[PDB]
Amino acid sequence: SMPVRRVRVVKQEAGGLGISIKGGRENRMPILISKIFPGLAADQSRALRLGDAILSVNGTDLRQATHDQAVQALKRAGKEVLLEVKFIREVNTVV
Structure with missing residues (x-):
């Protein structure tokens, strides 16, 4: 239930x-x-x-993506990406 953030990343032309x-x-x-x-x-x-959930990239939804589908989507999103991200607060409880 953390807020969503829309974050711009610009790739290198060779990267x-x-x-x-x-x-x-x-x-x-x-x-x-x-x-x-x-x-x-x-x-x-x-x-x-570290630990931000990537929910989407340039209009491509990744909330239900397989790993390989996410990797492809991010690799092919172009040189500038708008990522929708939400931080996941991990709680570890001893039980």
């Missing part, structure tokens, strides 16, 4: 977003940013966070 993602519909997991590489495109936006 990508400068993140890793995990997750995907095949495991009922959202697409999440698992790494932001220092000084690369997403890091230069200063607007993304």
Whole structure:
């Protein structure tokens, strides 16, 4: 229930977003940013966070994307992307 943020990232002409993602519909997991590489495109936006859920990219919805579908969508979204993201507050409870 964290607010959604719409975040611009501009890729290098010879490069990508400068993140890793995990997750995907095949495991009922959202697409999440698992790494932001220092000084690369997403890091230069200063607007993304480790653990942000990527909900969509340039009008392409990723809330129910498989991992491979998310990867393709982000890779093909063009040189400038508007990402809709929502931070996931992870709570770990000992039980």
